[PDB]
């Protein structure tokens, strides 16, 4: 599979540090983390242009990110809040092509 997200479903409590992981197989330079919520399209949280790089997207607030290797892009909720409950989608991409993961559903209680 091009893109794999870990875990696929997760429950957290307010103030917990939560890390979402995404592995790609394509060695693309670019990876992306989005959240999907009602009344919005997929909104970009952080993205990355390559190893050791991350860049804020449109809604970076209350997230960090890590790009330790070509294949791995993690999303870090450093102190989780109920508003971070969502479905999160990782993508790798090259040019105008995006290859999405299957999604991770996160409930922050």
């Amino acid at each position: 599979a091009a893109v794999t997200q870990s875990p696929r479903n997760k429950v957290a409590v307010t103030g917990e540090k939560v890390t979402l992981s995404c592995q790609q197989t394509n060695n693309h330079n670019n990876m992306y983390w989005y959240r999907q919520d009602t009344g919005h399209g997929l909104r970009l949280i952080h993205y990355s242009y390559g190893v050791g790089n991350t860049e804020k997207g449109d809604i970076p607030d209350g997230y960090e990110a890590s790009r330790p290797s070509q294949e791995q892009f993690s999303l870090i909720l450093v102190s989780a809040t109920p508003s971070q409950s969502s479905v999160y989608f990782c993508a790798s991409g090259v040019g105008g092509t995006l290859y999405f993961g299957a999604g991770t559903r996160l409930s922050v209680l």
């Binding site: 330079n29 952080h46 242009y49 390559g50 190893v51 050791g52 790089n53 991350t54 860049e55 804020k56 960090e64 990110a65 890590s66 330790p68 290797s69 070509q70």
Partner: protein
């Protein structure tokens, strides 16, 4: 010997609105290191390529280091050397002109010292003292170790900043608790020089261009050199 900086000569973290994680990344337990190696290739005229494999992860087996010009590269080209520096991947380019497009690659600037004559006996390490100032008062000092008699300023800078990320949160993901910082080197011969520790202003950080300052492959005498880190708080 450059004048020390005034506050207008210094990048402020408060004017950098991108991700300070991309600066932390270059210093936070991150370095290429090799002992007793010789260059295997070249890309452009002012650079050299070494076969060095990543220890920590498996992000590379090839490293290209860029120097000031071709003369500096020719000095080291056939030499048995040690390597130490901070590597980057975004906008790192080099033909392996064999294809070998399936091998991890990384890039860096300078970091090269002749191996023979440059080492102590029996695994001994030379200490180098770093004195830190915050808001123009000494706060702490700490030592860094190197295995080299003549050591690049780059290696020492990296060791100093690594310690301070961990002890002082020098760089965090989003910002810095400091507004300005420079690291200042003082050679026994009186020569001083400094590097700004903060990213240029605006919403992007170019890692390669920041690291390019290590271009000069500048070495200092570890036994005698002094180091100061000068910080102001937000």
């Amino acid at each position: 010997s450059q004048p020390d900086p005034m506050p207008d000569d210094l990048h402020k973290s408060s004017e950098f609105t991108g991700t300070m994680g991309n600066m932390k990344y270059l210093y936070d337990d991150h370095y290429v290191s090799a002992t007793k190696v010789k260059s295997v290739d070249k890309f452009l005229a002012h650079d050299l390529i070494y076969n060095i494999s990543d220890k920590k992860l498996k992000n590379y087996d090839k490293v290209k280091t860029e120097l000031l010009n071709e003369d500096l590269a020719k000095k080291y080209k056939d030499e048995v050397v040690d390597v130490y520096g901070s590597n980057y991947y975004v906008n790192c380019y080099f033909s392996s002109k064999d294809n070998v497009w399936w091998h991890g690659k990384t890039c860096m600037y300078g970091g090269i010292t002749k191996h023979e004559g440059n080492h102590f006996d029996n695994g001994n390490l030379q200490n180098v003292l770093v004195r830190v100032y915050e808001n123009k008062r000494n706060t702490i000092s700490f030592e860094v170790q190197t295995d080299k008699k003549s050591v690049t300023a780059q290696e020492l800078d990296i060791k100093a900043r690594n310690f301070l990320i961990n002890k002082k949160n020098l760089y965090e993901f989003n910002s810095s608790p400091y507004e300005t910082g420079y690291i200042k080197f003082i050679e026994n011969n009186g020569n001083t020089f400094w590097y700004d520790m903060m990213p240029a202003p605006g919403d992007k950080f170019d890692q390669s261009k920041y690291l390019m300052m290590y271009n000069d492959n500048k070495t200092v005498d570890s036994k005698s050199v002094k180091i100061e880190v000068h910080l102001t708080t937000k």
